[PDB]
Protein: plastocyanin
Organism: Populus nigra
Amino acid sequence: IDVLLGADDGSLAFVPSEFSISPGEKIVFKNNAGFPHNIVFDEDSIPSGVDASKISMSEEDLLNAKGETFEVALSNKGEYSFYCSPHQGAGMVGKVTVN
Ligand SMILES: [Cu+2]
């Protein structure tokens, strides 16, 4: 599944922001508008035992240019909350359910 980082009208949002996927399905986050952006998984809001480090960008890492991607595959079932660190306050947050 492809997820846009920033909407086509410049809104600071993940498009889509809430979605479900099957285990092993790849998520391709694509830098679109209002960059820089990043994708960070909340360590307190992911399934028990999962290493946030294996699926997240560092809060200091950034996708700076249009078209840059971050790809991740999730295996453990459950809900995962994620956000864009510089735009968290603006509401650039999401949640993926692995079912
Ligand atoms: Cu952002």
